[PDB]
Design a protein around this ligand. Structure first.
Ligand code: HEC
Ligand code: HEC
Length: 229
């Protein structure tokens, strides 16, 4: 693998590309507000692809976009064929954002691509960046949702809510995003899979959990309704 590096925003070039990248960051950070026609719930890309200092998709084991462009096209079992990065973004619009894929030459989509390509500067095509994706967590027993409920109340509820509906900020963006219910990800999302949710939670939430705790609280989270895909 190669190291995960985050480029300096102060070395963004002047011109069309630089302006595109800045727009791309905003689309990824503020997606419901910026692309209402394509988003069907309360999630922005950054809610599962977080980053620091205003960037998006820069955190190891939270599916960083650093180095993503050199990994596409790639086979998708979902599609039964090779897909492009543009198509992969469409998938998370349709599933994680319970919405509609942008046209593959949509200027907002190209801006998102430009941003991901900026984050990926210097990464060799085909190389795997350390910390890519969301590592799954799988245990050799059923997740205990009763235990998970107790864990949720103690470790998650203060942010994500008794009803899993999250916490809005002053500008109407989710400070703490919804984990279930009508404004959360739909059943087609990867985050609706036990081992992916458990993996995400293990590596990223709160903010630490044992494997058993992550497994069990993920189970509890996924007992709830959410939009159907
Ligand atoms: C509900 C959580 C969630 C939201 C919201 C979300 N994603 Fe994802 N995304 C995932 C998960 C989970 C993966 C799979 C990571 C892996 O392969 O390990 C993923 C994978 C991706 C990948 C492929 C990453 C890779 O390394 O191959 C891209 C590109 C991507 N998402 C773009 C987006 C964009 C753009 C948005 C905003 C429109 C978005 N996602 C919103 C959960 C989310
Ligand atoms: C201090 C507040 C806080 C606590 C406590 C917290 N979270 Fe989160 N959670 C967030 C924020 C903010 C995000 C959006 C991603 C980010 O910025 O890291 C998030 C994202 C998530 C996501 C992906 C986004 C979504 O809407 O589905 C899941 C799943 C999640 N948290 C589950 C949990 C679980 C389970 C716990 C308890 C173990 C937990 N979180 C504790 C603030 C919190």
């Amino acid at each position: 693998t190669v190291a995960l590096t985050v480029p300096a925003a102060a070395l963004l070039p002047d011109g069309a590309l630089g302006e595109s990248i800045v727009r791309g960051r905003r689309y990824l950070s503020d997606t419901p507000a910026q692309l209402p026609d394509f988003v069907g719930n309360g999630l922005a890309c950054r809610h599962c692809h977080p980053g620091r200092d205003g960037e998006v998709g820069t955190e190891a084991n939270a599916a960083p976009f650093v180095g993503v462009v050199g990994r596409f096209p790639q086979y998708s079992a979902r599609h039964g064929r090779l897909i492009t990065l543009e198509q992969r973004i469409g998938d998370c619009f349709e599933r994680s954002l319970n919405g509609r894929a942008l046209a593959l030459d949509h200027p907002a989509l190209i801006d998102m691509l430009a941003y991901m390509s900026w984050l990926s500067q210097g990464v060799p095509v085909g190389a795997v960046v350390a910390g890519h994706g969301i590592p799954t967590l799988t245990l050799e027993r059923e997740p205990d949702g009763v235990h998970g409920e107790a864990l949720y109340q103690a470790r998650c509820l203060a942010c994500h809510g008794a009803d899993g509906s999250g916490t809005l900020d002053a500008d109407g963006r989710y400070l703490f995003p919804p984990l279930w219910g009508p404004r959360s990800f739909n059943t087609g999302a990867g985050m609706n899979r036990q081992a992916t949710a458990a993996g995400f939670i293990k590596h990223n939430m709160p903010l630490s959990l044992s494997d058993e705790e992550a497994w069990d609280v993920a189970g509890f989270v996924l007992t709830h309704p959410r939009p159907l895909f």
